[PDB]
Amino acid sequence: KLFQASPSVPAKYVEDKEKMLSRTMQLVELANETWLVTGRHPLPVITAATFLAWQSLQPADRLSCSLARFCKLANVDLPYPASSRLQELLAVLLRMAEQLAWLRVLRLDKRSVVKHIGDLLQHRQSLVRSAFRDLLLPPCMLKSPKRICPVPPVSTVTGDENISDSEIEQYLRTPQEVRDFQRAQA
Amino acid sequence: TPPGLQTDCEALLSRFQETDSVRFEDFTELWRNMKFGTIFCGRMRNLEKNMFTKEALALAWRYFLPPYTFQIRVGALYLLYGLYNTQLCQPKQKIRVALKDWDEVLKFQQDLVNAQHFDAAYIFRKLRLDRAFHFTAMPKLLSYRM
Amino acid sequence: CVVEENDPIFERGSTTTYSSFRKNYYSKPWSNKETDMFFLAISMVGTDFSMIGQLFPHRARIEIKNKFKREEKTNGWRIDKAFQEKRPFDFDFFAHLLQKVLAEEEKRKQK
Amino acid sequence: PYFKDKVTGVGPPANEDTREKAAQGIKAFEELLVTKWKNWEKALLRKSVVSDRLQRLLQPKLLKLEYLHQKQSKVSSELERQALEKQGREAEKEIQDINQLPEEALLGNRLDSHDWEKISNINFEGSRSAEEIRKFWQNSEHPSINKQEWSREEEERLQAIAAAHGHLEWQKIAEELGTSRSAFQCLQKFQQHNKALKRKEWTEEEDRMLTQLVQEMRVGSHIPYRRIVYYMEGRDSMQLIYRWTKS
Amino acid sequence: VSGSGGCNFPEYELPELNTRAFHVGAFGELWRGRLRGAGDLSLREPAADSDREDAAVARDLDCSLEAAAELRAVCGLDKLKEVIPENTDLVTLGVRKRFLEHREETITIDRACRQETFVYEMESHAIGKKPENSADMIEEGELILSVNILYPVIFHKHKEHKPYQTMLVLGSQKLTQLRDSIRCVSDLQIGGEFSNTPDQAPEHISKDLYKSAFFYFEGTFYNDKRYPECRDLSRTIIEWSESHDRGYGKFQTARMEDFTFNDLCIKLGFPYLYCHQGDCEHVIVITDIRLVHHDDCLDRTLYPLLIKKHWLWTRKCFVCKMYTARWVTNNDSFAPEDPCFFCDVCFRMLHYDSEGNKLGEFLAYPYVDPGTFN
């Protein structure tokens, strides 16, 4: 509802429809080309992208606004992983800023790169190319996976046909344990 | 509230709590031997002394409001009486009172009319005639600064 | 008639809604002493989860089964040692240990 | 406490009197307030100006590199491919030299064209006005300004040059002074060091107005000497105090 | 519209913050009714004296001199303690001596007490002043209300909050008098561009142009209808308040020249609004309600004066730093800053040549400094 000025939402939060939709489309294309939507729910990424676009269209006024605050103002059920998707997308944007010259000198962060998100999408092709030159995977896999799929020791020792009857007896329940179980489940 | 003046008032009330009930004999003995009123002129400055006396009277009357024993009530009321009758100070102050406090003291007077507290009644009558009571809604000034 | 017994909720945005896929389970984790006494109960009974759930009132049988599967998948040597060792079934002392665990979790909540 | 008793601040309607006040030009004392500048604000200003300059320099180069990439991806010829690669490497070397240039020339001259409103609303979140940022960058945030204090050899020269020129143009006075400073600081120090105009030798025509002030707006014993000076032009605080306090 | 039904006694609602709703006219009426007064005349005393008090006690309850003759002798000054306050077991005297030492350390003689002397003189201005005409004598029992006002933002938000002046008002008098007595800087403020014509006298100040003003007390809108150029912003206010079910009930509208302080229904310590010139809003805090006394101002013509004239710092000329600024310039090249400030002589000698021609392009406006009333 950020297109028409309603009583609840003031005019500051209201932004243009076409420009914000184009920015969200560019952001979700970036997410699809940076391996962010593959394997994850798409709608959280869509929400994160539209939120970043709404913040980049006017960083000053809504720099303090949070994801839950935006969901409340828009009357939309907040997706759970949307926050994580936002944290990953902003990290990718920081990588793009490090790729760019003036931004890597400015030394921005996950809160100050929102004002230059727009510039990042101007030439995002070469930026993403260089970012992949220097694969997006879950955080649980990028923790220096040194021993990938450790080879288990093959143990095909079958004996002749069995082992012994001591294990049979140790598996069989003793009369004491039988009586105890019967007393317990009486 | 004035810290040291409140301390002095409470100490004098504690002493009145062991003095006689209502008779002015012990009040005279105190005013003679202890002279609770000492810091009134000294060598201080105009507004310092003014606010001193103002807060003194204000809190001494605010302490008259809650219900206590006759000792404490007489003590507070006539401490106020003495502090007002020894007003060698020049500016106008008047004791800070409340709206319903007037009806409370009116019921007190109606009780003295049947009680044998003639000395207390006469002193309160003189205090009324001296035009010492100034009434408000709150025993102090209040705003929305908090 | 409902005499202001409930409050209207401004939910169910007609526009759209998403899915959850996770509703109820919301289990509660274990601790070191709880894992120790759980291995004791294993060594004392076996793999029959019915008796284990009966003797554990405060933990669900499904959670106990999940824990046993996790131990079978991660710590096999511990399960082997538990099955190697054996203890006769104790009831009164086990109830005393249950009271002790209740007191311990009460102290934990206090902390 | 609060200053929003009636309209809390959620739906305050801009009424006719409000829009008329806004469109007439009556700016009493609200927008004209000035706040002191901070060190992190100075750093942010410098960083924003440098980034804006570098971005405006690189954007044409980036568009040219994009055009070269499009030519590479669309042209299937091999003879022109060598020329395209040579031009791409030339553009790469140009960008390399631009990035290698030291951080002393990319700040701009004293009076250069920039986008003050853009820089403000992007970096300063609108807290600093575009005009204030322009002035601060033109006369207080340049590396060519002499931060050294006046070495007792500028006041006399400045007053002489001002007498020669006509006291009409601070900029020309400062340029004739030639100490590589901003005219604002020069005039500030000159007027803080120089003598007053010495209107008259305490004629009672002004003393009677001072007495009228003492009778109409004085409260007790303290005297608002600044209220006095506001009407008694050509005077100074210390002298007026010492003189008017007596006799 | 009748007043809100409530007891005259101001029953508390929040601890040491404010009381509940109540009326003012009935408050004062009951206040005068529950006592006889007849003491605000200063006629105690400048011969037969015993018989008069004997007859007085004869109407009193005791009708005897047994206790009075002793108590009047006891309650004297000849038996009362100038002398140095020492040589006695005390408590507050320690703090007194510590303050005396702290004073002898740095405080020099008897001065630096600016606000103190201000309060002293502003309180003495109302001591025993008689009216010029005999018909202007304030009757006994008149309601005196103390009302703090917070108009401005330019002050210490840190120092426990003290932005603006406090006033005293009489009950029987009209609210229009308070309206006209509030000394707002926005009333002296003047709008218009005068860069090309600096010598032109600014005419039609904001006080005369924007006559729109209205009070707001407990949902009641008092709009001034004394002048034929006053608009009604309460119309748009009510439109906004009623366009949506925001929880605000219906508000009543009345005239300011027909409702006095007595007819108001206020809460001591509760903030009310006084909005004029569109956006110039004052937070009104009515703190105390008291009756008239012979020690207070007995002249109805200037009972409303001022009691807390908060000091304000004037904006000095940015060029010379010796005179208070009178003109504000925007988009001025010769000016060192954007929100710049100049006085008459500096502005004339900087922005104009030897003949008076406008040197350079800029936008100049008459800067009415806030420190114009004091």
Curated annotation (Swiss-Prot), chain A:
Start-end of each Sequence repeat: 1-69
TM stretches of this protein: none
Entry PTM: In response to oxidative stress, Cys-140 is reversibly oxidized to cysteine sulfenic acid. Oxidation of Cys-140 impairs formation of a ternary complex with TBP and DNA and down-regulates expression of target genes in response to oxidative stress.
Chain positions covered by the region annotation Required for the formation of a ternary complex with DNA and TBP: 136-142
Modified sites of kind Cysteine sulfenic acid (-SOH): 140
Complex formation: Component of TFIIIB complexes. The TFIIIB complex has two activities, alpha and beta. The TFIIIB-alpha activity complex is composed of TBP, BDP1, and a complex containing both BRF2 and at least four stably associated proteins; this complex inhibits the transcription by pol III via its phosphorylation by CK2; YY1 facilitates the TFIIIB-alpha complex formation. Interacts with TBP; this interaction promotes recruitment of BRF2 to TATA box-containing promoters.
Protein family: Belongs to the TFIIB family.
Protein name listed in UniProt: Transcription factor IIIB 50 kDa subunit
From Swiss-Prot, chain C:
Positions of the Myb-like domain: 22-72
Superkingdom in the source lineage: Eukaryota
Tissue spec: Isoform 2 is highly expressed in cerebellum.
Post-translational modification: Phosphorylated by CSNK2A1 during mitosis, resulting in its release from chromatin and suppression of polymerase III transcription.
Location within or outside the cell: Nucleus
Clinical disorder: Deafness, autosomal recessive, 112: A form of non-syndromic, sensorineural deafness characterized by postlingual progressive hearing impairment. Sensorineural deafness results from damage to the neural receptors of the inner ear, the nerve pathways to the brain, or the area of the brain that receives sound information.
The protein's name in its UniProt record: Transcription factor TFIIIB component B'' homolog
Source organism per UniProt: Homo sapiens
Gene (name only): BDP1
From Swiss-Prot, chain D:
Domain Myb-like as annotated: residue spans: 103-141, 197-247
Domain of life per record: Eukaryota
Coiled coil regions, renumbered to chain: none
Signal peptide limits: none
Ranges where the HTH myb-type domain occurs: 142-196
Cellular localization per UniProt: Nucleus
Residues in the DNA-binding region annotation: 170-194
Function of the protein: Part of the SNAPc complex required for the transcription of both RNA polymerase II and III small-nuclear RNA genes. Binds to the proximal sequence element (PSE), a non-TATA-box basal promoter element common to these 2 types of genes. Recruits TBP and BRF2 to the U6 snRNA TATA box.
Disease linked to the protein: Neurodevelopmental disorder with motor regression, progressive spastic paraplegia, and oromotor dysfunction: An autosomal recessive disorder characterized by delayed motor development and developmental regression after the first year of life, followed by progressive spasticity with gait alterations, paraparesis, and oromotor dysfunction. Most individuals have cerebral, cerebellar, or basal ganglia volume loss.
Subunit structure as annotated in this protein's UniProt entry: Part of the SNAPc complex composed of 5 subunits: SNAPC1, SNAPC2, SNAPC3, SNAPC4 and SNAPC5. SNAPC4 interacts with SNAPC1, SNAPC2, SNAPC5, BRF2 and TBP.
Identification of the protein by name: snRNA-activating protein complex subunit 4
Organism (species): Homo sapiens (Human)
Residue numbers of the full-length protein present here: 148 to 394 of 1469
From Swiss-Prot, chain E:
Keyword Metal-binding: no
Compartments (UniProt record): Nucleus
Keywords tagged on the record: DNA-binding, Nucleus, Transcription, Transcription regulation
Keyword Transcription found: yes
GO biological process: snRNA transcription; snRNA transcription by RNA polymerase II; snRNA transcription by RNA polymerase III; transcription by RNA polymerase II; transcription by RNA polymerase III
Principal location class: nucleus
GO molecular function term, any single one: DNA binding
A Pfam family it matches: SNAPC3
GO cellular component: nuclear body; nucleolus; nucleoplasm; nucleus; snRNA-activating protein complex
InterPro entries in alphabetical order: snRNA-activating_su3
Physiological role: Part of the SNAPc complex required for the transcription of both RNA polymerase II and III small-nuclear RNA genes. Binds to the proximal sequence element (PSE), a non-TATA-box basal promoter element common to these 2 types of genes. Recruits TBP and BRF2 to the U6 snRNA TATA box.
Quaternary structure note: Part of the SNAPc complex composed of 5 subunits: SNAPC1, SNAPC2, SNAPC3, SNAPC4 and SNAPC5. SNAPC3 interacts with SNAPC1.
Record-stated family: Belongs to the SNAPC3/SRD2 family.
Protein name per the record: snRNA-activating protein complex subunit 3
Species of the source: Homo sapiens (Human)
Gene: SNAPC3
